[PDB]
Amino acid sequence: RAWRPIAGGPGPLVLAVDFAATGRPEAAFADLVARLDPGTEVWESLQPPLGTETGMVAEDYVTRWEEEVRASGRRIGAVLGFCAGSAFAGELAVRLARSQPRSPRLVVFDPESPTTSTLYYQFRKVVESLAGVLGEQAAREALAEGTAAADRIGDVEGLGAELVRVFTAAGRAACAAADLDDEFADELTATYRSFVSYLVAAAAVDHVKCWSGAVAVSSATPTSGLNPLDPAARAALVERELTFDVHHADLLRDPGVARAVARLLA
Ligand SMILES: *[C@@H]1C(=O)N[C@@](O)(CC/C=C\C/C=C/C)[C@H]1O
């Protein structure tokens, strides 16, 4: 299955696209849907079973999500995405505008098309967050190799593949230097692999095309979402941009965000 219901309803459906990962710093769509209008039915995107995302490009990710919606027979009233998930949200919304008589609304939250920079920064934060499970040695070497990779590999797909190599090697080193359990380590390295696969495929989406009709919801974190862009570039990229004085990591749990989103969906 490619979708998980996270809030019930009678009615048109809301899809929410994100990489589900307990332990990340950022609030999640569960935090937003808790604060939306009751009766809003919401499904959250599931990743392919661990390992089966090997061999999937962006087209395959989107078709997998889209075919399950087609099979369900349900109509989609809105597609939400957060961060890199906004890329896939936009593509699904464009495809549903073509397959449905009436187009869904598209709302993207701090939308990002992954770059070598965002990939590398997220890699560093994953490693730091897991320094205790990996041990100081495997974590130190992972950062050293990842920095070297970021210095030498200029493209997103290639950097992602190398960072996954590095992280996999760190997990395997932790099982033989820091006493990390072997099945927890396979899960850890497989989950990071799935995350990078998702990010690299998200980067392949034509985000200029698919965000042209999006309403963007923006935090105040200057490195997040549309915030690094020139003002004229932001206005050209999306149809509308609402701003909120909250951190990126709090955006989806903020009551003001939820109030505005409920009105966008009404
Ligand atoms: C951008 C995105 O696509 N997901 C994020 O929540 C980042 C998740 C990245 C890393 C988890 C790092 C944990 C220490 C959003 O920022």
mmCIF file of N, CA and C in Angstrom, residues 166-248:
data_model
loop_
_atom_site.group_PDB
_atom_site.id
_atom_site.type_symbol
_atom_site.label_atom_id
_atom_site.label_comp_id
_atom_site.label_asym_id
_atom_site.label_seq_id
_atom_site.Cartn_x
_atom_site.Cartn_y
_atom_site.Cartn_z
ATOM 1 N N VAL A 166 28.364 6.081 2.249
ATOM 2 C CA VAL A 166 29.022 6.503 3.485
ATOM 3 C C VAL A 166 28.205 6.097 4.704
ATOM 4 N N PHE A 167 26.901 6.399 4.693
ATOM 5 C CA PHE A 167 26.070 6.102 5.857
ATOM 6 C C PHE A 167 25.923 4.601 6.068
ATOM 7 N N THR A 168 25.774 3.843 4.983
ATOM 8 C CA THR A 168 25.721 2.390 5.093
ATOM 9 C C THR A 168 26.998 1.852 5.727
ATOM 10 N N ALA A 169 28.155 2.351 5.269
ATOM 11 C CA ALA A 169 29.444 1.969 5.850
ATOM 12 C C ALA A 169 29.533 2.346 7.326
ATOM 13 N N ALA A 170 28.966 3.497 7.706
ATOM 14 C CA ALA A 170 28.964 3.888 9.117
ATOM 15 C C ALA A 170 28.113 2.943 9.954
ATOM 16 N N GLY A 171 26.926 2.589 9.458
ATOM 17 C CA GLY A 171 26.094 1.640 10.175
ATOM 18 C C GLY A 171 26.759 0.290 10.334
ATOM 19 N N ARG A 172 27.445 -0.171 9.293
ATOM 20 C CA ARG A 172 28.118 -1.454 9.410
ATOM 21 C C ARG A 172 29.331 -1.353 10.326
ATOM 22 N N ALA A 173 29.995 -0.195 10.349
ATOM 23 C CA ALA A 173 31.096 0.000 11.286
ATOM 24 C C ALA A 173 30.594 0.014 12.723
ATOM 25 N N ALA A 174 29.419 0.602 12.955
ATOM 26 C CA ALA A 174 28.860 0.656 14.300
ATOM 27 C C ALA A 174 28.513 -0.724 14.839
ATOM 28 N N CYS A 175 28.273 -1.676 13.962
ATOM 29 C CA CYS A 175 27.932 -3.017 14.473
ATOM 30 C C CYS A 175 29.202 -3.753 14.893
ATOM 31 N N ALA A 176 30.360 -3.215 14.548
ATOM 32 C CA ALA A 176 31.635 -3.931 14.775
ATOM 33 C C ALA A 176 32.624 -3.051 15.526
ATOM 34 N N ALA A 177 32.153 -1.964 16.120
ATOM 35 C CA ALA A 177 33.041 -1.060 16.871
ATOM 36 C C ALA A 177 32.262 -0.437 18.031
ATOM 37 N N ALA A 178 30.948 -0.281 17.864
ATOM 38 C CA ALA A 178 30.099 0.348 18.899
ATOM 39 C C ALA A 178 28.979 -0.571 19.374
ATOM 40 N N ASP A 179 29.030 -1.870 19.062
ATOM 41 C CA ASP A 179 28.023 -2.865 19.525
ATOM 42 C C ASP A 179 26.592 -2.542 19.083
ATOM 43 N N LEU A 180 26.408 -1.941 17.906
ATOM 44 C CA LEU A 180 25.036 -1.664 17.419
ATOM 45 C C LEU A 180 24.431 -2.979 16.927
ATOM 46 N N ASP A 181 23.202 -3.259 17.316
ATOM 47 C CA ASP A 181 22.488 -4.454 16.880
ATOM 48 C C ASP A 181 22.391 -4.501 15.360
ATOM 49 N N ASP A 182 22.566 -5.701 14.800
ATOM 50 C CA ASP A 182 22.685 -5.834 13.350
ATOM 51 C C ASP A 182 21.367 -5.583 12.632
ATOM 52 N N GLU A 183 20.236 -5.913 13.256
ATOM 53 C CA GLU A 183 18.955 -5.699 12.593
ATOM 54 C C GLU A 183 18.491 -4.253 12.717
ATOM 55 N N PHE A 184 18.790 -3.600 13.844
ATOM 56 C CA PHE A 184 18.556 -2.164 13.945
ATOM 57 C C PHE A 184 19.429 -1.399 12.955
ATOM 58 N N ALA A 185 20.630 -1.907 12.669
ATOM 59 C CA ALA A 185 21.526 -1.205 11.756
ATOM 60 C C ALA A 185 21.081 -1.344 10.305
ATOM 61 N N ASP A 186 20.649 -2.544 9.898
ATOM 62 C CA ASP A 186 20.073 -2.709 8.565
ATOM 63 C C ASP A 186 18.847 -1.822 8.387
ATOM 64 N N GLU A 187 18.009 -1.721 9.419
ATOM 65 C CA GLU A 187 16.860 -0.822 9.336
ATOM 66 C C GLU A 187 17.299 0.630 9.232
ATOM 67 N N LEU A 188 18.293 1.023 10.036
ATOM 68 C CA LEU A 188 18.783 2.396 10.016
ATOM 69 C C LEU A 188 19.347 2.754 8.647
ATOM 70 N N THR A 189 20.233 1.909 8.109
ATOM 71 C CA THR A 189 20.840 2.244 6.828
ATOM 72 C C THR A 189 19.836 2.122 5.689
ATOM 73 N N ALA A 190 18.887 1.188 5.781
ATOM 74 C CA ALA A 190 17.877 1.084 4.733
ATOM 75 C C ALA A 190 16.952 2.296 4.743
ATOM 76 N N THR A 191 16.647 2.826 5.934
ATOM 77 C CA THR A 191 15.757 3.982 6.025
ATOM 78 C C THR A 191 16.431 5.236 5.478
ATOM 79 N N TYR A 192 17.722 5.429 5.775
ATOM 80 C CA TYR A 192 18.414 6.563 5.172
ATOM 81 C C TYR A 192 18.503 6.396 3.657
ATOM 82 N N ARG A 193 18.750 5.172 3.173
ATOM 83 C CA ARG A 193 18.768 4.942 1.724
ATOM 84 C C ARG A 193 17.435 5.336 1.090
ATOM 85 N N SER A 194 16.332 4.908 1.702
ATOM 86 C CA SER A 194 15.003 5.253 1.208
ATOM 87 C C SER A 194 14.787 6.764 1.211
ATOM 88 N N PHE A 195 15.244 7.439 2.266
ATOM 89 C CA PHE A 195 15.121 8.895 2.343
ATOM 90 C C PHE A 195 15.858 9.582 1.203
ATOM 91 N N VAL A 196 17.119 9.205 0.963
ATOM 92 C CA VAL A 196 17.857 9.842 -0.125
ATOM 93 C C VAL A 196 17.227 9.515 -1.479
ATOM 94 N N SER A 197 16.744 8.279 -1.653
ATOM 95 C CA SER A 197 16.077 7.923 -2.904
ATOM 96 C C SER A 197 14.878 8.828 -3.143
ATOM 97 N N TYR A 198 14.117 9.063 -2.087
ATOM 98 C CA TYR A 198 12.973 9.967 -2.139
ATOM 99 C C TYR A 198 13.406 11.389 -2.466
ATOM 100 N N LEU A 199 14.469 11.886 -1.809
ATOM 101 C CA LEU A 199 14.934 13.249 -2.076
ATOM 102 C C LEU A 199 15.424 13.420 -3.507
ATOM 103 N N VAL A 200 16.200 12.456 -4.002
ATOM 104 C CA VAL A 200 16.755 12.569 -5.347
ATOM 105 C C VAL A 200 15.644 12.514 -6.388
ATOM 106 N N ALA A 201 14.669 11.622 -6.194
ATOM 107 C CA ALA A 201 13.524 11.584 -7.097
ATOM 108 C C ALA A 201 12.702 12.865 -6.998
ATOM 109 N N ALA A 202 12.536 13.414 -5.781
ATOM 110 C CA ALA A 202 11.851 14.700 -5.652
ATOM 111 C C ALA A 202 12.559 15.796 -6.443
ATOM 112 N N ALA A 203 13.898 15.801 -6.438
ATOM 113 C CA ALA A 203 14.652 16.814 -7.179
ATOM 114 C C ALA A 203 14.407 16.720 -8.673
ATOM 115 N N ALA A 204 14.036 15.538 -9.163
ATOM 116 C CA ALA A 204 13.831 15.348 -10.597
ATOM 117 C C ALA A 204 12.512 15.931 -11.092
ATOM 118 N N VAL A 205 11.553 16.153 -10.188
ATOM 119 C CA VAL A 205 10.280 16.756 -10.561
ATOM 120 C C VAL A 205 10.508 18.173 -11.076
ATOM 121 N N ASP A 206 9.777 18.542 -12.132
ATOM 122 C CA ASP A 206 9.801 19.900 -12.684
ATOM 123 C C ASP A 206 8.990 20.776 -11.742
ATOM 124 N N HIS A 207 9.665 21.304 -10.720
ATOM 125 C CA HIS A 207 8.940 22.021 -9.678
ATOM 126 C C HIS A 207 8.459 23.383 -10.159
ATOM 127 N N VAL A 208 9.149 23.985 -11.134
ATOM 128 C CA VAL A 208 8.663 25.237 -11.713
ATOM 129 C C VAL A 208 7.300 25.024 -12.353
ATOM 130 N N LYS A 209 7.160 23.939 -13.118
ATOM 131 C CA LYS A 209 5.872 23.620 -13.724
ATOM 132 C C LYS A 209 4.828 23.288 -12.664
ATOM 133 N N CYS A 210 5.148 22.380 -11.737
ATOM 134 C CA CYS A 210 4.061 21.918 -10.880
ATOM 135 C C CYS A 210 3.762 22.806 -9.679
ATOM 136 N N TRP A 211 4.576 23.804 -9.344
ATOM 137 C CA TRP A 211 4.171 24.722 -8.270
ATOM 138 C C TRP A 211 3.517 26.002 -8.777
ATOM 139 N N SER A 212 3.340 26.145 -10.096
ATOM 140 C CA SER A 212 2.821 27.397 -10.634
ATOM 141 C C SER A 212 1.413 27.703 -10.119
ATOM 142 N N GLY A 213 0.616 26.676 -9.821
ATOM 143 C CA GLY A 213 -0.695 26.847 -9.220
ATOM 144 C C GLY A 213 -0.771 26.579 -7.730
ATOM 145 N N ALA A 214 0.363 26.482 -7.043
ATOM 146 C CA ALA A 214 0.355 26.155 -5.619
ATOM 147 C C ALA A 214 0.159 27.397 -4.768
ATOM 148 N N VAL A 215 -0.524 27.207 -3.646
ATOM 149 C CA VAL A 215 -0.444 28.128 -2.518
ATOM 150 C C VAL A 215 0.664 27.623 -1.611
ATOM 151 N N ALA A 216 1.649 28.469 -1.345
ATOM 152 C CA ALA A 216 2.761 28.110 -0.478
ATOM 153 C C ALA A 216 2.487 28.639 0.921
ATOM 154 N N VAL A 217 2.878 27.855 1.919
ATOM 155 C CA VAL A 217 2.834 28.239 3.328
ATOM 156 C C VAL A 217 4.277 28.254 3.821
ATOM 157 N N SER A 218 4.750 29.428 4.241
ATOM 158 C CA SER A 218 6.170 29.657 4.489
ATOM 159 C C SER A 218 6.442 29.971 5.953
ATOM 160 N N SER A 219 7.463 29.330 6.507
ATOM 161 C CA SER A 219 7.949 29.638 7.852
ATOM 162 C C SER A 219 8.843 30.873 7.788
ATOM 163 N N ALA A 220 9.465 31.226 8.915
ATOM 164 C CA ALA A 220 10.423 32.321 8.962
ATOM 165 C C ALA A 220 11.880 31.870 8.952
ATOM 166 N N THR A 221 12.154 30.579 8.828
ATOM 167 C CA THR A 221 13.533 30.101 8.821
ATOM 168 C C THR A 221 14.223 30.468 7.510
ATOM 169 N N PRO A 222 15.251 31.325 7.513
ATOM 170 C CA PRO A 222 15.727 31.903 6.240
ATOM 171 C C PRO A 222 16.326 30.903 5.250
ATOM 172 N N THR A 223 16.771 29.727 5.683
ATOM 173 C CA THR A 223 17.293 28.723 4.764
ATOM 174 C C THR A 223 16.228 27.765 4.251
ATOM 175 N N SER A 224 14.990 27.872 4.725
ATOM 176 C CA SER A 224 13.963 26.879 4.434
ATOM 177 C C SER A 224 13.035 27.350 3.325
ATOM 178 N N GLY A 225 12.580 26.392 2.523
ATOM 179 C CA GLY A 225 11.473 26.651 1.616
ATOM 180 C C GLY A 225 11.819 27.700 0.582
ATOM 181 N N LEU A 226 10.914 28.661 0.419
ATOM 182 C CA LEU A 226 11.092 29.756 -0.523
ATOM 183 C C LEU A 226 11.916 30.898 0.049
ATOM 184 N N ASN A 227 12.279 30.843 1.330
ATOM 185 C CA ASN A 227 12.941 31.982 1.959
ATOM 186 C C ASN A 227 14.286 32.373 1.338
ATOM 187 N N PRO A 228 15.146 31.460 0.870
ATOM 188 C CA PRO A 228 16.397 31.918 0.228
ATOM 189 C C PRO A 228 16.187 32.670 -1.079
ATOM 190 N N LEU A 229 15.023 32.538 -1.709
ATOM 191 C CA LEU A 229 14.802 33.114 -3.027
ATOM 192 C C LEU A 229 14.619 34.624 -2.943
ATOM 193 N N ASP A 230 15.036 35.297 -4.009
ATOM 194 C CA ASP A 230 14.696 36.699 -4.213
ATOM 195 C C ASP A 230 13.178 36.885 -4.171
ATOM 196 N N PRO A 231 12.677 38.002 -3.625
ATOM 197 C CA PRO A 231 11.216 38.214 -3.600
ATOM 198 C C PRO A 231 10.532 38.063 -4.959
ATOM 199 N N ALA A 232 11.105 38.613 -6.030
ATOM 200 C CA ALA A 232 10.474 38.458 -7.334
ATOM 201 C C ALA A 232 10.455 37.001 -7.771
ATOM 202 N N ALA A 233 11.489 36.237 -7.405
ATOM 203 C CA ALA A 233 11.533 34.820 -7.751
ATOM 204 C C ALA A 233 10.454 34.034 -7.016
ATOM 205 N N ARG A 234 10.222 34.346 -5.735
ATOM 206 C CA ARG A 234 9.158 33.664 -5.002
ATOM 207 C C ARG A 234 7.812 33.952 -5.635
ATOM 208 N N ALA A 235 7.558 35.225 -5.946
ATOM 209 C CA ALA A 235 6.258 35.592 -6.485
ATOM 210 C C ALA A 235 6.019 34.945 -7.840
ATOM 211 N N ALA A 236 7.082 34.752 -8.627
ATOM 212 C CA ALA A 236 6.949 34.104 -9.925
ATOM 213 C C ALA A 236 6.735 32.606 -9.790
ATOM 214 N N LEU A 237 7.244 32.002 -8.719
ATOM 215 C CA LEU A 237 7.277 30.543 -8.662
ATOM 216 C C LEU A 237 5.926 29.949 -8.278
ATOM 217 N N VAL A 238 5.207 30.577 -7.347
ATOM 218 C CA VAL A 238 3.976 30.004 -6.822
ATOM 219 C C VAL A 238 2.840 30.986 -7.051
ATOM 220 N N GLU A 239 1.607 30.481 -6.917
ATOM 221 C CA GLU A 239 0.445 31.323 -7.184
ATOM 222 C C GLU A 239 0.204 32.313 -6.044
ATOM 223 N N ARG A 240 0.482 31.901 -4.811
ATOM 224 C CA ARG A 240 0.261 32.707 -3.616
ATOM 225 C C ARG A 240 1.193 32.180 -2.537
ATOM 226 N N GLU A 241 1.673 33.064 -1.662
ATOM 227 C CA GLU A 241 2.535 32.621 -0.573
ATOM 228 C C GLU A 241 2.079 33.281 0.719
ATOM 229 N N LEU A 242 1.638 32.477 1.681
ATOM 230 C CA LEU A 242 1.310 32.975 3.012
ATOM 231 C C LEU A 242 2.527 32.836 3.901
ATOM 232 N N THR A 243 2.755 33.814 4.775
ATOM 233 C CA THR A 243 3.930 33.750 5.629
ATOM 234 C C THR A 243 3.518 33.653 7.092
ATOM 235 N N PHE A 244 4.364 32.976 7.874
ATOM 236 C CA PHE A 244 4.111 32.733 9.289
ATOM 237 C C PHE A 244 5.406 32.913 10.061
ATOM 238 N N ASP A 245 5.302 33.567 11.220
ATOM 239 C CA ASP A 245 6.469 33.793 12.070
ATOM 240 C C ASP A 245 6.660 32.609 13.012
ATOM 241 N N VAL A 246 7.071 31.493 12.417
ATOM 242 C CA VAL A 246 7.339 30.267 13.152
ATOM 243 C C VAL A 246 8.576 29.626 12.543
ATOM 244 N N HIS A 247 9.217 28.768 13.324
ATOM 245 C CA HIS A 247 10.327 27.988 12.804
ATOM 246 C C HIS A 247 9.832 26.925 11.825
ATOM 247 N N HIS A 248 10.696 26.607 10.859
ATOM 248 C CA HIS A 248 10.439 25.528 9.908
ATOM 249 C C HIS A 248 9.968 24.273 10.630
#
